[PDB]
Design a protein around this ligand. Structure first.
Ligand SMILES: NC(=O)C1=CN([C@@H]2O[C@H](COP(=O)(O)OP(=O)(O)OC[C@H]3O[C@@H](n4cnc5c(N)ncnc54)[C@H](O)[C@@H]3O)[C@@H](O)[C@H]2O)C=CC1
Ligand SMILES: NC(=O)C1=CN([C@@H]2O[C@H](COP(=O)(O)OP(=O)(O)OC[C@H]3O[C@@H](n4cnc5c(N)ncnc54)[C@H](O)[C@@H]3O)[C@@H](O)[C@H]2O)C=CC1
Lengths: 335, 330, 330, 335
């Protein structure tokens, strides 16, 4: 099989290449986005591998079919960029990565928490220029504080295990509480209680209509002053305009956000005047204890390997006519 | 009692003031270093309070006695800056903070590990300027890796609990076993085995004559390529020239060092008769996955309060003629 | 003479030591502020040398007298920190430096202008990380633009020569003409015209009662969209809140400010209050093409050497008992 | 006419769109590199507009011809990326921009000099975070110092005008001395004299066999300690390895280099290594008074507009069958 990979970053290429020693596919790497115009680059490939910014809408799918492509593989969990209804009509098969390594994501959340707490990002900014001042760097001791985790799927639970290690009092909210968490000594609570008592709050849940703007002004009002908020889940979970105010009023002590590529263009203040973010990313980072990372939560060697393994295996199943458990369909509840 | 605080930073002032609400000392804050020249500023204070950079050598103490000081309180664990024998000769009394909050120090080490691992420090420099590129930011998953902790005292144990939460395999080297460490499932091993097997190495031990340059050229040779090394302990535990070389060779993946103020004129490479260089700090930080923090490991609100509480308590005990357990000699 | 130097920076020491060769004085460098409390450190010295942040108030001056000091030498132009008549009464003598090198200040204003224009400060933050992206860095060609200079004294004339070398049209506002500006082909205009026509505006004038908030909201309304504004003069020439607004609505393209230490504490956004901060320096630097320097305009080796020469000489005039032109009274 | 633009950056798009109001071409903007693989995206276009990293080798040109392309426009001065011999053989006409605005380039060189002199880039990194310390920021007064300019074409002369305004003593070297400079008050001198006497040295010359590694170890030894060196000309003008050593030894006070995209990969480390990296850019910037810009010298609105005007005008002349003075041929001397 010949595979064309779009939107390739160096890490994608390295891991896909490394993983491919097992599959022996023919790999063609493209830096650029898949679009209706670039689809013709796929001629002679059976499959394409795409990521979050790639265009999988119907006209792109039509071009891919004209050019002989049969399989579309997303090297990511998100799939909203792909028109599944069109894909079915075209007889095109679509596969994904089900979930990122839970340990990799939870660890990233924890990394963000600590970086913010000890002001390590600021410290490096000084020390790289041999400035050793500590003023404004003071953090807080984690042990004996309360951590609140929103969502107790595998990521949340992986977070909860690290948090326990810190010797934190553990609270969680999930509409469906888990046995694994309960076994860890987590206390399930209502949201309001979680808002009220938590020193650190970490979001590990999918975005559903129930939880759009889950953290709103009313939520911020409920929180402790100086609270730390970490979001490696989707942006919409937070009302960003509320979050900004909370920062100004110093309700939020610290904020860390892992910004999905598909979400950055909003994720804003925001005004219908002039000028907006990206300036907002710059301002917050400068004026507050604010940290953005660029959808980095899965960015470890082991996780990337997993993503590559799953993607190549999915493709292998498709070419072989084996039923692939990662197949997507139009009625999928998260489409 | 009037207390003159030297080398005052904004945090020192804030926490000392807050804690003193329960004590009522008369606090006089000075920004500058205590030296033989500045010691006269203390005239009219029974006590002084000092930190690692302040000069406690015999000539300074001589001036302090001249000027009526009876007590010296180090708002720190280290006392290498104070000449204890001269202090006793002069009839001065010296007290200290015995240990920092073990949790604060260990958490700092963990924070350093995570910032380095995920290149969070590099990431910030990009995103503060709305550069969202991820290339070169690749880390490693902690879970299922081996951590090697050198020293199983209170800090090392506090680190081991966190490292367990990460799901790491646990190794340690200590001349003495800790029951709390054992309870964690820590496997004590010889140092070479720890060097050979450890993905992440963290230093949590006091500097002794036995352990000067504990991490040397041979130690690095033993280590796994890509190893992460963290030092929130004293600098002289690591042979800096050998670490620099290990970085250049790519034996060391990541290095985090919490740089003692008194130790900054070390870590040198160096050259003969040129400057004093902090240029190395700049060079290493640019070239490699290296992080320096400036003796930041106890820098939390809770640890600072504790330091302050202990210092004022030490002083109150002297004033009352009580025996202070934190005295450096009788 | 033994001279004690307060508030010493490395640069003060280096240049002061250099100039001392012609003088032979004994110095005495202190990093700290001169205050009522530290004045006693001067004992043994005939003279002290102070800068802008040092305390020259009456009590400081008494303590200094008590401790045997006769002469106070400023290494700056400004003297509002010092109590003049009080010194007279004490029979204390105080010498200053008349003005800083005009070329050094003008060159700095031009440096600021170009750094802002080409976003050189932004490019460097990218390129230090080996990020070579150009997007957002676009400047404007200077040649053929209109430069507006407010104040045609020595610094302003120095700025004008440079601006002329760039091939700029030259406007100025001064209540007095300078023959040297006229010779450059400078065309004097009313302020409103200068505001209307100028691509680049640079301030080179002292603060007078009649120019406080010269650059105000009405002034900003007159200006071209995208205007670049430089102030190496005193902060109060610009109404800071108006400037912030004009930045927000994009009337001001670029703003460069050399921020006086004694002025830093104002710069009003200005919220009240929780609690006083220069979050504003941070917000402005991030959200716009804004550059702050820390009273850096006179900071060159040649300028420092000059400040050093005048100061030491100023001292010799005193010791010889001869007159000081830079003396602030008899 | 339909024009496909490769390697498009946002400033490129903005100026080309603005300029096109007068031309009325159909513009299609592509972010990615023109390659043999992406050449097919030009189908339906008479022309392409490319920049320094675009691949103009014969296989690409062959593909462009197959897809109907007639004209190739370089929006830059450099042209080594295009195989002119192949272009003639295929009947493809190639045009370029002859030179960049001389004022824009000279002004960039001066801007670098001043930022480096006053350490303005360092000041900003401190002041953006409200750090006002001046230690290490000390400069030198330009007035009364000596400037050496190497190359007296239009850029060098434009640079000399600015430098004259600083009240600098001016020296230059050019194998063919210019009237314009002589009229400025410039003293033409031999190189060793220029090296010996110059406080600031700026390069404004084309790269020739005669001047490859013009600035070498011997050049550096002749220089004044603390010399400032600015290069907005090509990289090969300086022996970088030698420049690094002079920096270590503190022969060079400050160095500014505008790094051509096509030259980025060079600038030797060395040890050739892994092989080859720009940790050296990172190090130099950190350990020394060093500044890189990424070929930013022509990056002003006025200069970009010129580039755009020239580019569209060259294309209209080609479509109209008028002789375009910017046409490139294989016997061109450069090359
Ligand atoms: N960045 C910073 O400011 C801080 C640095 N430290 C350093 O880290 C050390 C550990 O702190 P604590 O647990 O409070 O000390 P502790 O005195 O409770 O225990 C020290 C432990 O390290 C062990 N040890 C001694 N020599 C050793 C060697 N060669 N190898 C392995 N282990 C050895 C001891 O047997 C003991 O278990 C301190 O002694 C201190 O010097 C401690 C606090 C803050
Ligand atoms: N950032 C820095 O380091 C420095 C800033 N400066 C500032 O720049 C100022 C000027 O320096 P010099 O040229 O040496 O002074 P100078 O006395 O030679 O010239 C002052 C000029 O400004 C004019 N002026 C007075 N009021 C005016 C107004 N409302 N509008 C326009 N012009 C007015 C005077 O008529 C005179 O021509 C200083 O007074 C000082 O405040 C001075 C030295 C260093």
């Amino acid at each position: 099989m010949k595979l064309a990979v779009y939107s390739t970053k160096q890490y994608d290429k390295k891991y896909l290449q490394q993983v491919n020693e097992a599959f022996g596919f023919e790999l063609e790497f493209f830096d650029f986005l898949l679009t209706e115009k670039t689809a013709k680059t796929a001629n002679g490939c059976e499959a394409v591998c795409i990521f979050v910014n790639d265009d999988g809408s119907r006209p792109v799918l039509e071009e891919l079919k004209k050019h002989g492509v049969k399989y579309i593989a997303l090297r990511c969990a998100g799939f909203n960029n792909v028109d599944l209804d069109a894909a079915k009509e075209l007889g095109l098969q679509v596969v994904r990565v089900p979930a990122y390594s839970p340990e990799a994501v939870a660890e990233h959340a924890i990394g963000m928490m600590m970086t913010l707490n000890r002001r390590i990002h600021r410290a490096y900014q000084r020390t790289r220029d041999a400035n050793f001042s500590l003023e404004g760097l003071t953090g807080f001791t984690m042990h004996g504080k309360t951590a609140g985790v929103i969502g107790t799927g595998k990521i949340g639970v992986a977070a909860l295990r690290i948090l326990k290690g810190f010797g934190m009092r553990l609270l969680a909210f999930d509409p469906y509480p888990s046995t694994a968490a309960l076994d860890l000594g987590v206390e399930y609570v209502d949201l309001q209680t979680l808002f009220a008592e938590s020193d650190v709050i970490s979001l590990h849940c999918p975005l559903t209509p129930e939880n759009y703007h889950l953290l709103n002004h009313a939520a911020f009002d409920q929180m402790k002053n100086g609270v730390m908020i970490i979001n490696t889940s989707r942006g919409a979970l937070i009302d960003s305009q509320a979050a900004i105010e909370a920062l100004k009023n110093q309700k939020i002590g610290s904020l860390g956000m892992d910004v999905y590529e598909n979400e950055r263009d909003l994720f804003f203040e925001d005004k219908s005047v002039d000028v907006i973010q990206d300036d907002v990313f710059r301002r917050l980072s400068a004026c507050h204890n604010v940290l953005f990372t660029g959808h980095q939560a899965f960015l470890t060697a082991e996780a990337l390997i997993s993503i590559s393994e799953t993607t190549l295996q999915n493709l292998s199943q498709l070419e072989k006519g084996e039923a692939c458990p990662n197949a997507l369909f139009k009625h999928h509840h998260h489409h």
